[PDB]
Amino acid sequence: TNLCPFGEVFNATRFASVYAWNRKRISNCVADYSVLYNSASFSTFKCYGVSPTKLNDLCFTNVYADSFVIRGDEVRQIAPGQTGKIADYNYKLPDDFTGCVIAWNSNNLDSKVGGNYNYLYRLFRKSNLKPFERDISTEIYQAGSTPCNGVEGFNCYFPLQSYGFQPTNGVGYQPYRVVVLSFELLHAPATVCGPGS
Amino acid sequence: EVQLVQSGAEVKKPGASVKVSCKASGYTFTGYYMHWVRQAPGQGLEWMGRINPNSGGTNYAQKFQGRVTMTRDTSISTAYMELSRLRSDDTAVYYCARSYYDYWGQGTLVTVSSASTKGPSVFPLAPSSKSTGTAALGCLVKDYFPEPVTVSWNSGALTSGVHTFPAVLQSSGLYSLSSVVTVPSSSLGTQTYICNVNHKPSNTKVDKKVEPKSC
Amino acid sequence: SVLTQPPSVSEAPRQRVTISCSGSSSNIGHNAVHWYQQLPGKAPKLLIYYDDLLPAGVSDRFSGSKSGTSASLAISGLQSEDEADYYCAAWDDILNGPVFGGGTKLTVLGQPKANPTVTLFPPSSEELQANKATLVCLISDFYPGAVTVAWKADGSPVKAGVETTKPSKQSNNKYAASSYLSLTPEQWKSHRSYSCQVTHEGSTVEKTVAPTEC
Ligand SMILES: *[C@@H]1O[C@H](CO)[C@@H](O[C@@H]2O[C@H](CO)[C@@H](O[C@@H]3O[C@H](CO)[C@@H](O)[C@H](O)[C@@H]3O)[C@H](O)[C@H]2NC(C)=O)[C@H](O)[C@H]1NC(C)=O
């Protein structure tokens, strides 16, 4: 009876910025996915490569829980084959993704009267992200011929920008917490299984 | 919060020099370019030059090459702009601005004039070719220094249709303005129109009667 | 000036206006466009950077785009607080520095449009006796408060000696502006006619004076 520390991920008091998205490896434990999948708390719960109802009977070598906060209208970007600043520069899912994307509105936690500017995202990158790649660099983005040499100015832009989370905003601009579960089946003993495995 | 606070308004004679300061707060002074942008009264913005506050490298607009010096004192997070051999047409509000002008100072007025305290002389702007339906008349308040002047009509009895314009700074280094009134043309042969001009920087106070003219 | 903007635009509250910024290959063609808002009597402020990005705290009613060597700023849900001069700027590779547009005055229509009345005063007899000659062109009762003033002596455009005030609000809330042509008496008597030409909302009105007539 080792249950998986999902509450540590789903109920964590603070979430990471999407550009520095948190990853937690889940290993050597019993996981009840039924409770998550059947919870009305999650407005988004779309799986790729797996049936959610079948999870309670499967075993996996490992499970990863990636978490971050984005804007409501950016949740659509957390899916295979999407484009946009979030999919391109912050968090990319492979075309062969095997896992589930979970999201719920966090306006009551991540909004502050006057704007919460603690959650950041990457707006500039010379290059798209590879699937599951993380880029936490803060080098000035050189958009021109001239080098920036660590000073911001014309064509020399800081690569991260802050979200403005105000409780007044429309739903599309409110913060959403997102948890992406990936299911890995490697040539090794499976350590994560559902209760009815 | 990022703040850029500039030194106060300057009055300089042609040929002299002006040094304007810009104190930065709320960020790492050496991490962002500083620019100087000027704006002649009522005109557009004009870029003068830039300084890298880390390296101290400068780059100037062609038309100010040889006349401007931009410097920085990192120990007090201050940038400076010194403009030499001033000309009348250097009268302007001068701004410092950070990076891609993402934050601006509040601006420093520099007025370049060779002039001392002087009261205006007042000339009449007569109406013409209107018998009996509206006619414009006024007064030209010419060559005074410094600003400002006050103008009333008939010791304040006439306010309807009255407008007093802002001043212009002439090439002379002296200010001029006009005040006009619109009146019925059929009132000209009867009603008397006097502009009362008071210059409080000097102590000149002039009353000029504006009467119709004989062509 | 290096970038060309419309001098003037206007639209009703709650509607959408657009402001164009026109450049060349050396600036807009290769570099990012930026937009600045200057409220009356205040310093400029950044509105848009890198063509379409918004600084933190800038309302999403403002948006920008670039196509080729041209750029535009779009303001939706027009509010009366948006009345300001708007400037674009971009880096220019040939001049090795950032260049400005001439600026665009935005009016949010809160009253009926009104044509200027114009009066061109010749130099006064008193002023001539002081050995001076100032032609005084007064412009009043127009809305929106945006005009272009042009002087012609006989058939040539007059640029030197001209000073013009930015439109100022009248007591009736229409706008007025003034223009001066400062001459010597000899210049004044050497031409046959002088004219002050006032362009407002695409219409140009003209008044003329002549040294021998009134
Ligand atoms: C994240 O935290 C919340 C709150 O601490 C967890 O939800 C709560 O879980 C408890 C125990 O599972 C629930 O108590 C039960 O409530 C039901 C209501 O019908 C009742 O029938 C049971 O007898 C029991 O008292 C509690 O209601 C529930 N709260 C909410 C708001 O759902 C949640 O499980 C945590 N998430 C994870 C992944 O651990």
CSV table of N, CA and C in Angstrom, one decimal, chain C residues 33-179:
chain,number,residue,atom,x,y,z
C,33,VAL,N,8.9,47.8,-35.2
C,33,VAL,CA,8.2,49.1,-35.1
C,33,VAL,C,7.8,49.3,-33.6
C,34,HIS,N,7.8,50.5,-33.1
C,34,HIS,CA,7.3,50.8,-31.8
C,34,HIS,C,6.4,52.0,-31.8
C,35,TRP,N,5.5,52.0,-30.8
C,35,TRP,CA,4.5,53.0,-30.8
C,35,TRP,C,4.5,53.7,-29.4
C,36,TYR,N,4.2,55.0,-29.4
C,36,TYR,CA,4.3,55.8,-28.2
C,36,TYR,C,3.1,56.7,-28.2
C,37,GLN,N,2.5,56.9,-27.0
C,37,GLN,CA,1.4,57.7,-26.7
C,37,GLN,C,1.9,58.9,-25.9
C,38,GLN,N,1.5,60.2,-26.4
C,38,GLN,CA,1.9,61.3,-25.6
C,38,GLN,C,0.6,62.1,-25.3
C,39,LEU,N,0.1,62.0,-24.1
C,39,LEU,CA,-1.1,62.8,-23.7
C,39,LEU,C,-0.7,64.2,-23.6
C,40,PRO,N,-1.7,65.1,-23.8
C,40,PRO,CA,-1.4,66.6,-23.8
C,40,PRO,C,-0.7,67.0,-22.5
C,41,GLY,N,0.4,67.8,-22.8
C,41,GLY,CA,1.2,68.3,-21.7
C,41,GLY,C,2.0,67.3,-20.9
C,42,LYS,N,2.1,66.0,-21.3
C,42,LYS,CA,2.8,65.0,-20.6
C,42,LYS,C,4.0,64.4,-21.4
C,43,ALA,N,4.7,63.6,-20.8
C,43,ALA,CA,5.8,62.9,-21.5
C,43,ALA,C,5.2,61.7,-22.3
C,44,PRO,N,5.9,61.3,-23.4
C,44,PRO,CA,5.5,60.1,-24.1
C,44,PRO,C,5.5,58.9,-23.2
C,45,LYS,N,4.9,57.8,-23.6
C,45,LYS,CA,4.9,56.5,-23.0
C,45,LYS,C,4.8,55.4,-24.0
C,46,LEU,N,5.5,54.3,-23.7
C,46,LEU,CA,5.5,53.2,-24.6
C,46,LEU,C,4.1,52.5,-24.6
C,47,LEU,N,3.6,52.2,-25.8
C,47,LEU,CA,2.4,51.5,-26.1
C,47,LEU,C,2.5,50.2,-26.7
C,48,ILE,N,3.4,50.1,-27.8
C,48,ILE,CA,3.7,48.8,-28.5
C,48,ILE,C,5.1,48.7,-28.7
C,49,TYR,N,5.7,47.5,-28.6
C,49,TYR,CA,7.1,47.3,-28.9
C,49,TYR,C,7.2,46.0,-29.7
C,50,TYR,N,8.2,45.9,-30.5
C,50,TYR,CA,8.5,44.7,-31.4
C,50,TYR,C,7.2,44.4,-32.2
C,51,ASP,N,6.7,45.5,-32.9
C,51,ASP,CA,5.6,45.4,-33.8
C,51,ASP,C,4.2,45.3,-33.2
C,52,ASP,N,4.0,44.2,-32.3
C,52,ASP,CA,2.7,43.9,-31.8
C,52,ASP,C,2.6,43.6,-30.3
C,53,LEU,N,3.8,43.6,-29.6
C,53,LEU,CA,3.8,43.3,-28.2
C,53,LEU,C,3.4,44.5,-27.3
C,54,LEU,N,2.7,44.1,-26.2
C,54,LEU,CA,2.1,45.1,-25.3
C,54,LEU,C,2.9,45.1,-24.0
C,55,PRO,N,3.4,46.3,-23.5
C,55,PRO,CA,4.0,46.3,-22.2
C,55,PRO,C,3.0,46.0,-21.2
C,56,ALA,N,3.5,45.5,-20.0
C,56,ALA,CA,2.6,45.2,-18.9
C,56,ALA,C,1.8,46.4,-18.5
C,57,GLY,N,0.5,46.3,-18.3
C,57,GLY,CA,-0.3,47.4,-17.9
C,57,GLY,C,-0.9,48.2,-19.1
C,58,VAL,N,-0.7,47.8,-20.3
C,58,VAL,CA,-1.2,48.6,-21.5
C,58,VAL,C,-2.4,47.8,-22.0
C,59,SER,N,-3.6,48.5,-22.1
C,59,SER,CA,-4.8,47.8,-22.5
C,59,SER,C,-4.8,47.2,-23.8
C,60,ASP,N,-5.4,46.0,-24.0
C,60,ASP,CA,-5.4,45.3,-25.2
C,60,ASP,C,-6.4,45.9,-26.2
C,61,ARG,N,-7.0,47.0,-25.9
C,61,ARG,CA,-7.6,47.8,-27.0
C,61,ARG,C,-6.6,48.3,-28.0
C,62,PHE,N,-5.3,48.4,-27.6
C,62,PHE,CA,-4.3,48.9,-28.5
C,62,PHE,C,-3.6,47.7,-29.1
C,63,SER,N,-3.5,47.7,-30.5
C,63,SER,CA,-2.7,46.6,-31.1
C,63,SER,C,-1.9,47.2,-32.3
C,64,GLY,N,-0.9,46.4,-32.7
C,64,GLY,CA,-0.1,46.9,-33.8
C,64,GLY,C,0.3,45.8,-34.7
C,65,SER,N,0.6,46.2,-36.0
C,65,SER,CA,1.0,45.2,-37.0
C,65,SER,C,2.0,45.9,-38.0
C,66,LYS,N,2.8,45.0,-38.6
C,66,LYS,CA,3.7,45.5,-39.6
C,66,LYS,C,3.6,44.6,-40.9
C,67,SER,N,3.5,45.1,-42.0
C,67,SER,CA,3.5,44.4,-43.3
C,67,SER,C,4.4,45.1,-44.3
C,68,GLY,N,5.5,44.5,-44.7
C,68,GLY,CA,6.5,45.1,-45.6
C,68,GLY,C,7.2,46.2,-44.9
C,69,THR,N,7.2,47.4,-45.5
C,69,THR,CA,7.8,48.6,-45.0
C,69,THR,C,6.8,49.6,-44.3
C,70,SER,N,5.7,49.0,-43.8
C,70,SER,CA,4.7,49.8,-43.2
C,70,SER,C,4.1,49.1,-42.0
C,71,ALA,N,3.5,49.9,-41.1
C,71,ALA,CA,3.0,49.5,-39.9
C,71,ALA,C,1.8,50.3,-39.5
C,72,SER,N,0.9,49.7,-38.7
C,72,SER,CA,-0.3,50.4,-38.3
C,72,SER,C,-0.6,50.1,-36.8
C,73,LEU,N,-1.1,51.1,-36.1
C,73,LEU,CA,-1.6,51.0,-34.8
C,73,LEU,C,-3.1,51.0,-34.9
C,74,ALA,N,-3.8,50.1,-34.2
C,74,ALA,CA,-5.3,50.1,-34.2
C,74,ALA,C,-5.8,50.3,-32.8
C,75,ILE,N,-6.7,51.2,-32.6
C,75,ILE,CA,-7.3,51.5,-31.3
C,75,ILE,C,-8.8,51.2,-31.4
C,76,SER,N,-9.3,50.1,-30.7
C,76,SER,CA,-10.7,49.7,-30.6
C,76,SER,C,-11.3,50.2,-29.3
C,77,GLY,N,-12.6,50.3,-29.2
C,77,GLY,CA,-13.3,50.8,-28.1
C,77,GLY,C,-12.8,52.2,-27.7
C,78,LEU,N,-12.7,53.0,-28.7
C,78,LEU,CA,-12.1,54.4,-28.5
C,78,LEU,C,-12.7,55.1,-27.3
C,79,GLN,N,-11.8,55.6,-26.4
C,79,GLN,CA,-12.2,56.3,-25.2
C,79,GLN,C,-11.6,57.7,-25.3
C,80,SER,N,-12.3,58.6,-24.6
C,80,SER,CA,-11.9,60.0,-24.7
C,80,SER,C,-10.5,60.3,-24.1
C,81,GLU,N,-10.1,59.4,-23.2
C,81,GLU,CA,-8.8,59.4,-22.6
C,81,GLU,C,-7.7,59.0,-23.6
C,82,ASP,N,-8.1,58.5,-24.8
C,82,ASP,CA,-7.1,58.1,-25.8
C,82,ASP,C,-6.6,59.3,-26.6
C,83,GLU,N,-7.3,60.5,-26.5
C,83,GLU,CA,-6.8,61.7,-27.2
C,83,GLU,C,-5.4,62.0,-26.9
C,84,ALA,N,-4.6,62.0,-27.9
C,84,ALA,CA,-3.1,62.1,-27.7
C,84,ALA,C,-2.5,62.2,-29.0
C,85,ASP,N,-1.2,62.5,-29.0
C,85,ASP,CA,-0.3,62.3,-30.2
C,85,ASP,C,0.3,61.0,-30.1
C,86,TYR,N,0.3,60.3,-31.2
C,86,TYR,CA,0.9,58.9,-31.3
C,86,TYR,C,2.0,59.0,-32.3
C,87,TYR,N,3.2,58.4,-31.8
C,87,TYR,CA,4.4,58.3,-32.6
C,87,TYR,C,4.8,56.9,-32.8
C,88,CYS,N,5.3,56.6,-34.0
C,88,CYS,CA,6.0,55.3,-34.3
C,88,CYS,C,7.5,55.5,-34.3
C,89,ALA,N,8.2,54.5,-34.0
C,89,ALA,CA,9.7,54.5,-34.1
C,89,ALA,C,10.2,53.2,-34.4
C,90,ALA,N,11.3,53.1,-35.2
C,90,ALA,CA,12.0,51.9,-35.6
C,90,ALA,C,13.5,52.3,-35.8
C,91,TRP,N,14.4,51.3,-35.6
C,91,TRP,CA,15.8,51.4,-35.9
C,91,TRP,C,15.9,51.5,-37.5
C,92,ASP,N,16.9,52.3,-37.9
C,92,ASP,CA,17.2,52.5,-39.3
C,92,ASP,C,18.6,52.1,-39.5
C,93,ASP,N,18.8,51.1,-40.4
C,93,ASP,CA,20.2,50.5,-40.7
C,93,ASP,C,21.1,51.5,-41.4
C,94,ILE,N,20.6,52.4,-42.2
C,94,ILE,CA,21.4,53.3,-43.0
C,94,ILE,C,21.9,54.5,-42.1
C,95,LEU,N,21.0,55.0,-41.2
C,95,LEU,CA,21.4,56.1,-40.3
C,95,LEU,C,22.0,55.6,-39.0
C,96,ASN,N,22.0,54.3,-38.8
C,96,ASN,CA,22.6,53.7,-37.6
C,96,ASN,C,22.0,54.2,-36.3
C,97,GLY,N,20.7,54.4,-36.3
C,97,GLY,CA,20.0,54.8,-35.1
C,97,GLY,C,18.4,54.8,-35.3
C,98,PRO,N,17.7,55.0,-34.2
C,98,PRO,CA,16.2,55.0,-34.2
C,98,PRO,C,15.7,56.3,-34.8
C,99,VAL,N,14.7,56.1,-35.7
C,99,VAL,CA,14.0,57.2,-36.4
C,99,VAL,C,12.6,57.3,-35.9
C,100,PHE,N,12.0,58.5,-36.0
C,100,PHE,CA,10.7,58.8,-35.5
C,100,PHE,C,9.7,59.0,-36.7
C,101,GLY,N,8.4,58.8,-36.5
C,101,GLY,CA,7.4,59.4,-37.4
C,101,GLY,C,7.1,60.8,-36.9
C,102,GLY,N,6.4,61.6,-37.7
C,102,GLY,CA,6.1,63.0,-37.4
C,102,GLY,C,5.0,63.1,-36.3
C,103,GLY,N,4.3,62.0,-36.0
C,103,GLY,CA,3.3,62.0,-35.0
C,103,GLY,C,1.9,62.2,-35.6
C,104,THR,N,0.9,61.7,-34.9
C,104,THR,CA,-0.5,61.8,-35.3
C,104,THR,C,-1.3,62.2,-34.2
C,105,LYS,N,-2.1,63.3,-34.3
C,105,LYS,CA,-3.0,63.7,-33.3
C,105,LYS,C,-4.4,63.0,-33.5
C,106,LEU,N,-4.8,62.3,-32.4
C,106,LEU,CA,-6.0,61.6,-32.4
C,106,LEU,C,-7.1,62.4,-31.7
C,107,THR,N,-8.2,62.7,-32.4
C,107,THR,CA,-9.4,63.3,-31.8
C,107,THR,C,-10.5,62.2,-31.6
C,108,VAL,N,-11.0,62.1,-30.4
C,108,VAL,CA,-12.2,61.3,-30.2
C,108,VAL,C,-13.4,62.2,-30.3
C,109,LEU,N,-14.2,62.1,-31.3
C,109,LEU,CA,-15.3,63.1,-31.6
C,109,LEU,C,-16.3,63.2,-30.5
C,110,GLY,N,-16.3,64.3,-29.8
C,110,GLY,CA,-17.2,64.6,-28.8
C,110,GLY,C,-18.1,65.9,-29.0
C,111,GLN,N,-18.0,66.4,-30.2
C,111,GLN,CA,-18.8,67.6,-30.6
C,111,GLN,C,-18.9,67.5,-32.2
C,112,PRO,N,-19.7,68.4,-32.8
C,112,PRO,CA,-19.8,68.4,-34.2
C,112,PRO,C,-18.5,69.0,-34.8
C,113,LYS,N,-18.1,68.5,-36.0
C,113,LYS,CA,-17.1,69.1,-36.7
C,113,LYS,C,-17.5,70.5,-37.1
C,114,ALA,N,-16.5,71.4,-37.1
C,114,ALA,CA,-16.7,72.8,-37.4
C,114,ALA,C,-15.6,73.4,-38.2
C,115,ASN,N,-15.9,74.2,-39.2
C,115,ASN,CA,-14.9,74.7,-40.2
C,115,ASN,C,-14.3,76.0,-39.5
C,116,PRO,N,-13.0,76.2,-39.9
C,116,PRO,CA,-12.4,77.4,-39.3
C,116,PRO,C,-12.8,78.7,-40.0
C,117,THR,N,-13.0,79.7,-39.1
C,117,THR,CA,-13.1,81.1,-39.7
C,117,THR,C,-11.7,81.7,-39.6
C,118,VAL,N,-11.3,82.4,-40.6
C,118,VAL,CA,-9.9,82.9,-40.7
C,118,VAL,C,-9.9,84.4,-41.0
C,119,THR,N,-9.0,85.1,-40.3
C,119,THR,CA,-8.8,86.6,-40.6
C,119,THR,C,-7.4,86.8,-40.7
C,120,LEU,N,-6.9,87.4,-41.8
C,120,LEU,CA,-5.6,87.8,-42.1
C,120,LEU,C,-5.4,89.3,-41.9
C,121,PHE,N,-4.7,89.7,-40.8
C,121,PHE,CA,-4.5,91.1,-40.5
C,121,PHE,C,-3.2,91.5,-41.2
C,122,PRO,N,-3.2,92.6,-41.9
C,122,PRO,CA,-1.9,93.2,-42.4
C,122,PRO,C,-1.2,93.9,-41.2
C,123,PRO,N,0.1,94.2,-41.4
C,123,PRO,CA,0.8,95.0,-40.4
C,123,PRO,C,0.0,96.3,-40.1
C,124,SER,N,0.0,96.7,-38.8
C,124,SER,CA,-0.7,97.9,-38.4
C,124,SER,C,0.1,99.1,-38.8
C,125,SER,N,-0.6,100.3,-38.9
C,125,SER,CA,0.1,101.5,-39.2
C,125,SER,C,1.1,101.9,-38.1
C,126,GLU,N,0.7,101.6,-36.9
C,126,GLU,CA,1.6,101.8,-35.8
C,126,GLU,C,2.9,101.0,-35.9
C,127,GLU,N,2.7,99.7,-36.2
C,127,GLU,CA,3.9,98.8,-36.3
C,127,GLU,C,4.8,99.2,-37.5
C,128,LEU,N,4.2,99.6,-38.6
C,128,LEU,CA,5.0,100.0,-39.7
C,128,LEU,C,5.8,101.3,-39.3
C,129,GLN,N,5.2,102.2,-38.5
C,129,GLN,CA,5.9,103.3,-38.1
C,129,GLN,C,7.0,103.0,-37.1
C,130,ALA,N,7.0,101.8,-36.5
C,130,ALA,CA,8.1,101.3,-35.7
C,130,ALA,C,9.1,100.5,-36.6
C,131,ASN,N,8.9,100.6,-37.9
C,131,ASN,CA,9.8,99.9,-38.9
C,131,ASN,C,9.8,98.4,-38.8
C,132,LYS,N,8.6,97.9,-38.5
C,132,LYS,CA,8.3,96.4,-38.5
C,132,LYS,C,7.0,96.1,-39.3
C,133,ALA,N,6.9,94.8,-39.7
C,133,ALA,CA,5.8,94.4,-40.4
C,133,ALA,C,5.4,93.0,-40.1
C,134,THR,N,4.4,92.7,-39.3
C,134,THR,CA,3.9,91.4,-39.0
C,134,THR,C,2.5,91.1,-39.5
C,135,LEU,N,2.4,90.2,-40.4
C,135,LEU,CA,1.1,89.7,-40.8
C,135,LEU,C,0.6,88.7,-39.8
C,136,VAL,N,-0.6,88.8,-39.4
C,136,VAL,CA,-1.2,88.0,-38.3
C,136,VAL,C,-2.4,87.3,-38.8
C,137,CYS,N,-2.3,86.0,-38.9
C,137,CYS,CA,-3.4,85.1,-39.4
C,137,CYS,C,-4.0,84.4,-38.2
C,138,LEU,N,-5.3,84.7,-37.9
C,138,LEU,CA,-6.0,84.2,-36.7
C,138,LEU,C,-7.0,83.2,-37.2
C,139,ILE,N,-7.1,82.0,-36.6
C,139,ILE,CA,-7.9,80.9,-37.0
C,139,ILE,C,-8.7,80.5,-35.7
C,140,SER,N,-10.0,80.4,-35.8
C,140,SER,CA,-10.9,80.1,-34.6
C,140,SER,C,-12.1,79.3,-35.0
C,141,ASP,N,-12.7,78.7,-33.9
C,141,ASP,CA,-14.0,78.0,-34.0
C,141,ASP,C,-13.9,76.8,-34.9
C,142,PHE,N,-12.9,76.0,-34.8
C,142,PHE,CA,-12.8,74.8,-35.6
C,142,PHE,C,-12.7,73.6,-34.7
C,143,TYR,N,-13.1,72.4,-35.2
C,143,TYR,CA,-13.1,71.1,-34.5
C,143,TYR,C,-13.2,70.0,-35.5
C,144,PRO,N,-12.3,69.0,-35.4
C,144,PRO,CA,-11.3,68.7,-34.4
C,144,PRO,C,-10.2,69.8,-34.4
C,145,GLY,N,-9.4,70.0,-33.4
C,145,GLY,CA,-8.4,71.0,-33.3
C,145,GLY,C,-7.1,70.6,-33.9
C,146,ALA,N,-7.2,70.5,-35.3
C,146,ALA,CA,-6.0,70.1,-36.0
C,146,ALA,C,-6.1,70.8,-37.4
C,147,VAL,N,-5.0,71.7,-37.6
C,147,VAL,CA,-4.9,72.4,-38.9
C,147,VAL,C,-3.5,72.4,-39.4
C,148,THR,N,-3.4,72.6,-40.7
C,148,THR,CA,-2.1,72.9,-41.3
C,148,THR,C,-2.2,74.3,-41.9
C,149,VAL,N,-1.2,75.1,-41.6
C,149,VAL,CA,-1.1,76.5,-42.1
C,149,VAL,C,0.0,76.7,-43.1
C,150,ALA,N,-0.3,77.3,-44.2
C,150,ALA,CA,0.7,77.6,-45.3
C,150,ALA,C,0.6,79.0,-45.7
C,151,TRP,N,1.8,79.6,-45.9
C,151,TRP,CA,1.9,81.0,-46.3
C,151,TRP,C,2.5,81.0,-47.8
C,152,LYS,N,1.9,81.9,-48.6
C,152,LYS,CA,2.4,82.1,-49.9
C,152,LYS,C,2.5,83.6,-50.1
C,153,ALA,N,3.7,84.1,-50.7
C,153,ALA,CA,3.8,85.5,-51.1
C,153,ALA,C,3.9,85.5,-52.6
C,154,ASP,N,2.9,86.2,-53.2
C,154,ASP,CA,2.7,86.1,-54.7
C,154,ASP,C,2.6,84.6,-55.0
C,155,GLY,N,3.6,84.0,-55.7
C,155,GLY,CA,3.5,82.6,-56.1
C,155,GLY,C,4.5,81.7,-55.4
C,156,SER,N,5.2,82.2,-54.3
C,156,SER,CA,6.2,81.2,-53.8
C,156,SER,C,5.8,80.9,-52.3
C,157,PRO,N,6.0,79.6,-51.9
C,157,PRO,CA,5.8,79.2,-50.5
C,157,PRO,C,6.8,79.9,-49.6
C,158,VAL,N,6.2,80.5,-48.5
C,158,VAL,CA,7.0,81.2,-47.5
C,158,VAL,C,7.2,80.3,-46.3
C,159,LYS,N,8.5,79.9,-46.1
C,159,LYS,CA,8.9,79.1,-44.9
C,159,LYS,C,9.5,79.9,-43.8
C,160,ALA,N,10.4,80.8,-44.2
C,160,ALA,CA,11.2,81.6,-43.2
C,160,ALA,C,10.3,82.7,-42.7
C,161,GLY,N,10.5,83.1,-41.4
C,161,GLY,CA,9.7,84.1,-40.8
C,161,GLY,C,8.3,83.7,-40.3
C,162,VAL,N,8.0,82.4,-40.3
C,162,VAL,CA,6.6,81.9,-40.0
C,162,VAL,C,6.7,81.3,-38.6
C,163,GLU,N,5.8,81.7,-37.7
C,163,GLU,CA,5.6,81.1,-36.4
C,163,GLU,C,4.1,80.8,-36.2
C,164,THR,N,3.8,79.6,-35.8
C,164,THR,CA,2.4,79.1,-35.7
C,164,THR,C,2.2,78.4,-34.3
C,165,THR,N,1.1,78.8,-33.6
C,165,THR,CA,0.7,78.1,-32.4
C,165,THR,C,-0.1,76.8,-32.6
C,166,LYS,N,0.2,75.8,-31.7
C,166,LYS,CA,-0.7,74.7,-31.8
C,166,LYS,C,-2.1,75.0,-31.4
C,167,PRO,N,-3.1,74.4,-32.0
C,167,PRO,CA,-4.5,74.7,-31.6
C,167,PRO,C,-4.7,74.7,-30.1
C,168,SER,N,-5.4,75.7,-29.7
C,168,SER,CA,-5.7,75.9,-28.3
C,168,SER,C,-7.2,75.9,-28.1
C,169,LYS,N,-7.7,75.4,-27.0
C,169,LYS,CA,-9.2,75.3,-26.8
C,169,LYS,C,-9.7,76.7,-26.4
C,170,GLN,N,-10.9,77.0,-27.0
C,170,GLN,CA,-11.6,78.2,-26.7
C,170,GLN,C,-12.5,78.1,-25.6
C,171,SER,N,-13.1,79.2,-25.1
C,171,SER,CA,-14.1,79.1,-24.0
C,171,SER,C,-15.4,78.4,-24.4
C,172,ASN,N,-15.7,78.4,-25.7
C,172,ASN,CA,-16.8,77.6,-26.2
C,172,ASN,C,-16.5,76.2,-26.5
C,173,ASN,N,-15.3,75.7,-26.3
C,173,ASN,CA,-14.8,74.4,-26.5
C,173,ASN,C,-14.4,74.1,-27.9
C,174,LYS,N,-14.6,75.0,-28.9
C,174,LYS,CA,-14.0,74.8,-30.2
C,174,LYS,C,-12.5,75.2,-30.0
C,175,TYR,N,-11.7,75.0,-31.1
C,175,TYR,CA,-10.3,75.3,-31.1
C,175,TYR,C,-10.0,76.5,-32.0
C,176,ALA,N,-8.8,77.1,-31.6
C,176,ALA,CA,-8.2,78.2,-32.4
C,176,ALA,C,-6.7,78.1,-32.4
C,177,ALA,N,-6.2,78.7,-33.5
C,177,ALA,CA,-4.7,78.7,-33.7
C,177,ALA,C,-4.3,80.1,-34.3
C,178,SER,N,-3.1,80.4,-34.2
C,178,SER,CA,-2.5,81.7,-34.7
C,178,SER,C,-1.2,81.4,-35.5
C,179,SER,N,-1.0,82.2,-36.5
C,179,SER,CA,0.2,82.2,-37.3
C,179,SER,C,0.7,83.6,-37.6
